[PDB]
Amino acid sequence: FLGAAGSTMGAASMALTVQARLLLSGIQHMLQLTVWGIKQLQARVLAVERYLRDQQLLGIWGCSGKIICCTNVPWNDSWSNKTINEIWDNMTWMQWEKEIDNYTQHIYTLLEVSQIQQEKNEQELLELD
Amino acid sequence: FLGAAGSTMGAASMALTVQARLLLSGIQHMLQLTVWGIKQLQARVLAVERYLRDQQLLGIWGCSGKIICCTNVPWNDSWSNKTINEIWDNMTWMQWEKEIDNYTQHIYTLLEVSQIQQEKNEQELLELD
Amino acid sequence: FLGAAGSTMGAASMALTVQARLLLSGIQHMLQLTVWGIKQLQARVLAVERYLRDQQLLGIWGCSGKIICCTNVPWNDSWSNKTINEIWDNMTWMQWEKEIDNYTQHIYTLLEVSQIQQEKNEQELLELD
Amino acid sequence: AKKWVTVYYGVPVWKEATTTLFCASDAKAYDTEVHNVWATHACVPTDPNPQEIVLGNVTENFNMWKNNMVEQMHEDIISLWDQSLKPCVKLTPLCVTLNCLINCNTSVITQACPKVSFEPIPIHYCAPAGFAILKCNSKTFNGSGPCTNVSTVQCTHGIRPVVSTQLLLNGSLAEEEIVIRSENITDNAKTIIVQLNEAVEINCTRIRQAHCNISKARWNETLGQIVAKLEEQFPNKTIIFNHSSGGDPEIVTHSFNCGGEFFYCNTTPLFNSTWNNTRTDDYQNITLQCRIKQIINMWQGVGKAMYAPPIRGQIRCSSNITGLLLTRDGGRDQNGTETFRPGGGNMRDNWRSELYKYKVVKIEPLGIAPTACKRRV
Amino acid sequence: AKKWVTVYYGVPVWKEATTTLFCASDAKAYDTEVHNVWATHACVPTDPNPQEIVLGNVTENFNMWKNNMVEQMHEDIISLWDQSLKPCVKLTPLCVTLNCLINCNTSVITQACPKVSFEPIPIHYCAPAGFAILKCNSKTFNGSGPCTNVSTVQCTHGIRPVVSTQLLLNGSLAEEEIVIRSENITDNAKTIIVQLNEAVEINCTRIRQAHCNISKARWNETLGQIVAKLEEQFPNKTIIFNHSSGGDPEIVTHSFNCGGEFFYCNTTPLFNSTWNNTRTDDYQNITLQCRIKQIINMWQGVGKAMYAPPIRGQIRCSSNITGLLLTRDGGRDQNGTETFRPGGGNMRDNWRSELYKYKVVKIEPLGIAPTACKRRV
Amino acid sequence: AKKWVTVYYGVPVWKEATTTLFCASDAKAYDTEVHNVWATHACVPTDPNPQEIVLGNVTENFNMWKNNMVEQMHEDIISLWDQSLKPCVKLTPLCVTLNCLINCNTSVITQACPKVSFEPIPIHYCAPAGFAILKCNSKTFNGSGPCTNVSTVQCTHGIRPVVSTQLLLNGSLAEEEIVIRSENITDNAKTIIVQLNEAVEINCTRIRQAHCNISKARWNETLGQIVAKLEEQFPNKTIIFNHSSGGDPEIVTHSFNCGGEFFYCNTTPLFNSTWNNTRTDDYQNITLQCRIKQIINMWQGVGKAMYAPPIRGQIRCSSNITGLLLTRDGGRDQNGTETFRPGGGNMRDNWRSELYKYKVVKIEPLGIAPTACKRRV
Q: Is there a contact between F48 and A33 if contact means CB atoms under 8 Å apart?
A: yes
Residue A20: burial class (beta carbons within 10 Å; 0-12, 13-18, 19+) = middle
Backbone φ and ψ for F77, nearest 5 degrees, come out as -60, -45
- Report angle CA E193, E194, E195 to the nearest 5 degrees: 125
Please report, for chain C, the start and end positions of each structural domain, with discontinuous segments joined by +.
Answer: 1-125
Nearest Cα to A3, choosing from A106, A94, A107, A126? A94
- B-C contacts at Cβ under 8 angstroms: 39
Q: In 10 A of CB C104, how many CB atoms?
A: 14
* Touching chains F and E? (3+ Cβ pairs < 8 A): no
| Helix or strand (DSSP H, E) at D369 | strand D366-371
- Three-state DSSP string of D175-187: CCCCEEECCCCCC
Measured CA to CA, the distance from residue A94 to residue A81 in angstroms comes to 18
Breaks (C-N over 2.5 A) in chain F follow: 100, 206, 283
Cross-chain CB nearest to B6 (options D44, D56, D377): D56
- Strand E238-241 relative to strand E337-342: parallel, antiparallel, unpaired? parallel
* Touching chains A and C? (3+ Cβ pairs < 8 A): yes
CA trace torsion E116, E119, E125, E129 (10° rounding) = -40
- A-C contacts at Cβ under 8 angstroms: 33
Measured CA to CA, the distance from residue B75 to residue B107 in angstroms comes to 9
CA distances from F287 to F74, F211, F284, F291, F302 (A): 34, 6, 9, 13, 33
To the nearest whole Å, the CA of F353 is away from the closest chain A CA by 29
To the nearest whole Å, the CA of C24 is away from the closest chain F CA by 10
CATH 2.170.40.20 fits E9-377, yes or no: yes
Q: Quick check: helix, strand or coil at residue E98? A: coil
Measured CA to CA, the distance from residue D11 to residue B12 in angstroms comes to 10
Measured CA to CA, the distance from residue F45 to residue F155 in angstroms comes to 12
Residue D265 neighbours by CB under 8 Å, 6+ apart: D204, D210, D212, D253, D254, D255, D256, D288, D289, D290, D291
Q: What resolution in Å is listed for this PDB structure?
A: 3.9
Residue from D2, D4, D11, D49 to probe the interface with B (highest B Cβ count within 10 Å): D11
Measured CA to CA, the distance from residue B36 to residue B42 in angstroms comes to 10
- Strand F295-297 relative to strand F164-165: parallel, antiparallel, unpaired? unpaired
Nearest Cα to F317, choosing from F248, F280, F265, F362? F265
Residue from B56, B111, B126 to probe the interface with A (highest A Cβ count within 10 Å): B56
Nearest Cα to D133, choosing from D53, D42, D73? D53
Nearest Cα to C50, choosing from E130, A47, B3? E130
Nearest Cα to B39, choosing from E164, A27, D131, F273? D131
Q: Which residues of C touch A (CB under 8 A)?
A: 17, 20-21, 23-25, 33-34, 37-38, 41, 44-45, 48, 51, 65-67
CA distances from C91 to B95, C9, C10, C86, E11 (A): 56, 8, 10, 8, 13
- The rounded Cα B98 to chain-centroid distance in angstroms is 16
Q: Is the dihedral of CA D167, D168, D170, D173 positive or negative?
A: negative
To the nearest whole Å, the CA of A108 is away from the closest chain B CA by 24
DSSP string, D69-90: THHHHHHHHHHHHHHHS--SB-
Q: Is there a contact between B3 and D13 if contact means CB atoms under 8 Å apart?
A: no
The residues that bridge with F194 in the sheet, in sequence order, are F180, F324
b/e code F310-346 from CB counts within 10 Å (16+ = b):
beeeebebebebbbbbbbbeeeeeeeeebbbebbbbe
CA distances from D19 to D22, D68, D129, D362 (A): 10, 10, 10, 10
The residues that bridge with F306 in the sheet, in sequence order, are F89, F295
Backbone φ and ψ for E227, nearest 5 degrees, come out as -65, -35
Decide if F237 touches B, using CB distance below 8 A.
no
Residue A25: burial class (beta carbons within 10 Å; 0-12, 13-18, 19+) = exposed
Contact E55, E152 (CB under 8 A): yes
Breaks (C-N over 2.5 A) in chain E follow: 100, 206, 283
Measured CA to CA, the distance from residue B9 to residue A116 in angstroms comes to 45
